[PDB]
Amino acid sequence: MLVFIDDGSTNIKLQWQESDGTIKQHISPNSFKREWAVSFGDKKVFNYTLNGEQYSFDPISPDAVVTTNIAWQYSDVNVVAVHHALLTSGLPVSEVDIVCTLPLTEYYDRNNQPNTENIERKKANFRKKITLNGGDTFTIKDVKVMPESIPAGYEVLQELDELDSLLIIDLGGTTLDISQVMGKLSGISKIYGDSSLGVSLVTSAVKDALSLARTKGSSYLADDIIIHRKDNNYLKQRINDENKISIVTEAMNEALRKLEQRVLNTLNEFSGYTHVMVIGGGAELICDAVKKHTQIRDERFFKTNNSQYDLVNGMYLI
Amino acid sequence: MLVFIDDGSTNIKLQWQESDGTIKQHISPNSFKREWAVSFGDKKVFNYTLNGEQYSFDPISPDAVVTTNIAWQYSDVNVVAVHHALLTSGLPVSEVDIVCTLPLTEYYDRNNQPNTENIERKKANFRKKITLNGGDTFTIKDVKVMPESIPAGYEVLQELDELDSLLIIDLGGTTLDISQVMGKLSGISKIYGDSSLGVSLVTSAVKDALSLARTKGSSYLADDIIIHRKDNNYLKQRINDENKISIVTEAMNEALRKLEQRVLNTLNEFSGYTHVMVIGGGAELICDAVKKHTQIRDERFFKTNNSQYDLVNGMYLI
Amino acid sequence: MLVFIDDGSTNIKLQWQESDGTIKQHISPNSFKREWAVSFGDKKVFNYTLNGEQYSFDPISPDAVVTTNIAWQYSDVNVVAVHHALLTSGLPVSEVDIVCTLPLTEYYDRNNQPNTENIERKKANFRKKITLNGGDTFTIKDVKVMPESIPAGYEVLQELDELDSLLIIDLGGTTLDISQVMGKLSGISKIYGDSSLGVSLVTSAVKDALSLARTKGSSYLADDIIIHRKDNNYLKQRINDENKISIVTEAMNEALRKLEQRVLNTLNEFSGYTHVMVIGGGAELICDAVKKHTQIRDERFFKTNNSQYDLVNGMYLI
Amino acid sequence: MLVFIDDGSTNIKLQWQESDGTIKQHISPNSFKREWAVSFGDKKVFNYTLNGEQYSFDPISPDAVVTTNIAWQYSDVNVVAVHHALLTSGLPVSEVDIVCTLPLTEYYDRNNQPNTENIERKKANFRKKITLNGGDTFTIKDVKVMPESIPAGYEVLQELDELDSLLIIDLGGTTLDISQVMGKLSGISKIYGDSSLGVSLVTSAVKDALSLARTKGSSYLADDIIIHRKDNNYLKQRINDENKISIVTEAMNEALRKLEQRVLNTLNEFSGYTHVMVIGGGAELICDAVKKHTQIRDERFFKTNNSQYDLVNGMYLI
Amino acid sequence: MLVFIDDGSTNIKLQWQESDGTIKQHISPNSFKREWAVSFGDKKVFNYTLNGEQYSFDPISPDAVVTTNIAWQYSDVNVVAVHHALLTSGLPVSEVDIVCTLPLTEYYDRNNQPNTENIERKKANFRKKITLNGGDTFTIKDVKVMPESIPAGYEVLQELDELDSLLIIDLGGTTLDISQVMGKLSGISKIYGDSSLGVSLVTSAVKDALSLARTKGSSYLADDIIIHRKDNNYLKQRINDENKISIVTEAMNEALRKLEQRVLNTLNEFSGYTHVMVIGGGAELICDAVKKHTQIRDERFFKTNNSQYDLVNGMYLI
Ligand SMILES: Nc1ncnc2c1ncn2[C@@H]1O[C@H](COP(=O)(O)OP(=O)(O)NP(=O)(O)O)[C@@H](O)[C@H]1O
Ligand SMILES: Nc1ncnc2c1ncn2[C@@H]1O[C@H](COP(=O)(O)OP(=O)(O)NP(=O)(O)O)[C@@H](O)[C@H]1O
Ligand SMILES: Nc1ncnc2c1ncn2[C@@H]1O[C@H](COP(=O)(O)OP(=O)(O)NP(=O)(O)O)[C@@H](O)[C@H]1O
């Protein structure tokens, strides 16, 4: 099979069609500790070994390595993460072939051409050899790359025309990727990638707030707080023992407001967009401010019900 | 081949006869950005390099260089534009020979003789060396020039007589060129060229109106508005998000009315014309006001169905 | 060669015998604009330079200089006109010698002798130096003058007798020249020259009528109207766009009738004429009124088929 | 007030008597660009709006509209020009009444009577509505016309007699107006107007010479060169950067010599003048050649110290 | 005090006269990171808080925000920058009143009048409330604006005359501002502002070159390279560890040559300038090419010894 992995910093997204026309979407959060897991026998398992150090999954605790740093797309951790995600697919273990991502800024340069060097460093990373203990790993044979902007506009761009342009706003954990594509993928006017502007901004405050609230925890738990920002009762079941939900919520809310400003300022680098779309899990978080700031009328704004998956789906339906 | 390029400021017009008696008319809008295009592979392409800077096509966005300035007929951009136009001809890439234009005022002087200096500066411009990346460019060998007035009257002038005169009104993007030719090209009484009076007058207001309407765009898009001035529904599909079609249409209409006055005033420099013709894409825009102002009876007024092409056709059928 | 130029105000008439006994008659209308002609290469040409100003031919348009003023026989324009006429002869360019005209009043004075002063001013005018651009002009060496009356009667006067007299009426564009010659050129009784009575009278009304009819034009075009006064259809092909042929024809007809009166009044200054002849292009216009007013019987009235040329032929066949 | 405006093509001349017996002469050069002026606040101002287009003053640069064309006496520009001139008078803004000019040829026709049609078209032009921005314009109520020949001879004609005639030569920018008036305004023998023979002849060569000398400029600057033709040092302060003062001066001198010829030829249409006067700013330029050509003795030749103003003064002191 | 801040994109320039007739010039580079500075106590300090986010100075490292984007004249950063600059003046902290800049294109519009809207948005920006921690900030009371072209010509324009024109070329980091002012500030013929043509062109290539040379750095460091382009030894002390000075210098030199072309092309929009001046820090970089291209003689070309300060000085000495 050719199988699609959108390897994001925080979540691996898979698209893959079992020959029965069965196209499947499978997501896997990345949260890895640099040591093995301790067993009590009932499929408690998934300890991986690669180039000295070893790893195993941990969703909940600190010293799961933080992956918001830029160079995640050449990390050894990345290889671990992707293997682990595909090992929980429900696929027949085998050799297979894949397509993966690069961030917008990685492919390109001063004269807006493919950065073959960085593209190939990427391909080479998935050659690294890795062992899971009691069990065989899938083998990853052929690798190719796509950028992280275009394909999420795919369907919408089709029924657009030839003289108009769709602004695709991709906000991920690490990177804000913006592209303007004129009227189908007939043309791509302008791209922009800002690897310092991600959802990380608030997560990496709220981590510190949770530590103040005596809940020193994983990045994943912190994101779980951000996802359920609206229910104070839910947050009671996660913030360890306090009336100081109050310290955390306000610190979270302040830093949330301060994300918007810098993201919107970045948008005013582009103009002449006829249609505007917002994809990525972070779309949920900024959607209304964007829609309102760009004065687009309802029919020209498309924001989907599974924003998190738009990109890998697009990669597939090319 | 000898191939005919009417190189207008805004549109390159080509006439060229494949030896099978096949004479072809091909037009190409000029809209170029001073940087390369960004690829996704499916003949996405056409990045040109000449004397330091580089260029690529963009129909839609600002910072495509505005070519309404006078000196376009010695611009490096011009060379780019003409090469690009011929690269989309469907011709066998090769060495070839061409004829091109000069504006009426460029050929001539105080004692109404050829301005060999300006004629030769023109020829020399098409010697400039240029590279397109993955592909070979046609080579332009022998160059000659014709003026931008005479040849569009050619057929009509033939079946005129010898004692009467045809007024050819050429309105282009930059230049209003008027000539009076007595009874076939047996004689040419009077010429006149006004390089400050072009269609640009309205385009360069409506550009600013579109920016007010939050549609900061290419000259080409603005011309597309002017071409479809009559359908408010069409203009809904181009004016980005507004009841303020209203601001744009009136500003456009006012500036349109104010073109006519200055063009008609210019005509009252000539007299004794028996026959009147109007050529160029701009003919469409002023035709009725001229016809009515000059009190010519129907049989003496000739305005064609492809006004935009009259000149290059004339160049050819000499 | 000695070549004959009847230099009339409006038309240069040439007579010249190629040594093969080949006597040729060639006429050239004078209509000159004080600036050079504009080329498209196909023998488009004939720009002359003399004593500062320059000239070129224009048959059709105003600001061709009007030559009905008296002093035409010392004008610099005259030199231009005569050179131009001989340059279209089909002669081998060279040095040559010529005879030319003077009006009746110019040769003579109070005691009816040659006016050597005016005769010599005339000769000196054809010494003026003149350049045509790409080409050599004929050189005019020896010059002599004849008066504008006698020689047109030449053949008829021969077979007349010795006791009877022939009235020669020369009506030109500027001048009415009348002479009575008794019985061959054995004697010349009486001359009379009226330089204010020419065909100009009607031409210079009809010019203004044509301007009323929005056909502001050359003197030549106006004469072309006068020549084809009889065909309303012809005049439709020249009068620019009107039911107001009506304004022009009546104004022309009125002024035509008013010529006759003053010319006939002038004739009643002479008496005792046995034979009457009318020469010049204007003869056509007044012939019947004269014939009828002078009650001459048919056999004594001679009006030729090429009245325009009678004088230069006479100059030659002396 | 009844206020006198000699509206010449190039300069508006005003005469006007503040009720304190204060008669004032005020002149204003016409040089107008078809767009508004850009402010820095210190009475930087004078932007006028009339019938679509707008205007403001510019003395120095090209695309100030050239007003040497004939139809200036029905131009909308004319109205602008006259308003502007009167706005710099130092008059109390108000309703007022005026007398203005027409060229000699405009008043008259084939039967030498007032051309009421053209006289009234003139009157109607000054009804046009015009706005200056921050400020009120004078209102022009009652309008009458005078011809451009007679009144400049006024005083001199008074102390002439009744049997002799004064030739008034008016040379303006566009028009050569000549009149012969017998012995006071007791009679006017003959008029003549040549609207193609003005000072423009040299100005419109020297403009092109200045462009050759890389000094592409206003008509006004060119006239400023003509006015200071005698000081090479002055012309150093205006001709932008060159030893090629040499190219300009000779081209100017040649075209100057070639004016004289055609103007003198025009004079030989008149005769029997006892007294000769030369008025207009152009008088300065041709005075000596005329005086010498007409062999008038000193006491019969009157050429004034403010030739430019003779006409408007005459209009007033009728 | 009224104190003069020329707020340029890259450098704040101050002029201010301590009542002792003491006029002072003080410049401050803008380079700000969106987080606070870390102390070791010895006046290590200058952390500012405004509308959520905070800022502090950093000259040396990336993620100091790049201010070459257009909208810098309404940025919150701008307010920070200006406060910071004035906090290092050596002034008594207080309420004070200021004048500041706008770019040429910001003041004006289609009908060349003040753009009150943009002028007032500017004034309002300096109302924003800001806190520096341990210390009081100056309070900015009254604000007015001047354009970025005129005042740098001030002294020179005074001793010019009234019929000639001075071309002031302002090249800044973001904007090329050109103005032609006729003979003192008696008149201003033509302005032009190109906000896409700044020194940024080369800086924003050389930034990327430095990253190739493993010296990923601040804009300021990159400018420091450009300033000391001539000493290879100096550049050894800044380019981190390489024989590949070679990669950087050539990339810098190429992009430098390609600035000139586009700036000179822009100049050929103006003509008739008698005097030419070049101001701004960028003047140093293009001076010779301009001087040579415009063929001005030495005495008409003025380029000062503190080009960077010409504008704020002019603002003051109005
Ligand atoms: N439904 C959601 N509600 C709230 N927060 C969410 C939601 N989905 C995702 N997030 C958060 O947003 C973060 C970044 O968005 P996401 O699109 O998942 O990044 P990614 O694709 O994994 N990485 P990348 O695009 O490479 O930066 C996630 O890690 C979560 O913390
Ligand atoms: N069919 C049309 N309807 C309306 N506007 C048109 C049409 N065709 C052209 N135009 C407009 O008229 C402008 C100038 O006419 P055009 O003849 O196309 O110029 P050109 O020959 O390419 N250039 P030039 O003659 O050098 O100024 C175009 O750029 C369009 O904006
Ligand atoms: N065949 C003709 N029919 C009608 N009108 C004619 C004809 N030939 C000439 N004319 C008119 O008569 C005018 C004067 O007669 P023409 O004899 O041609 O003058 P000329 O000899 O050239 N000049 P001149 O004798 O010096 O006044 C011409 O200019 C024509 O307008």
Ligand SMILES: Nc1ncnc2c1ncn2[C@@H]1O[C@H](COP(=O)(O)OP(=O)(O)NP(=O)(O)O)[C@@H](O)[C@H]1O
């Ligand atoms: N004192 C002068 N010395 C030299 N040239 C002058 C002088 N005064 C005027 N001129 C030139 O002569 C031109 C025409 O003369 P002028 O009398 O000023 O015209 P006008 O009366 O304003 N116009 P008009 O009579 O309608 O053609 C001016 O535009 C100047 O170029």
Ligand SMILES: Nc1ncnc2c1ncn2[C@@H]1O[C@H](COP(=O)(O)OP(=O)(O)NP(=O)(O)O)[C@@H](O)[C@H]1O
């Ligand atoms: N002396 C110098 N030598 C070389 N480069 C310089 C010099 N001074 C300034 N520059 C460069 O030129 C750039 C822009 O010129 P500068 O006049 O400083 O801009 P500004 O006035 O601060 N901003 P703006 O006019 O709004 O674009 C600076 O940021 C430097 O990179």
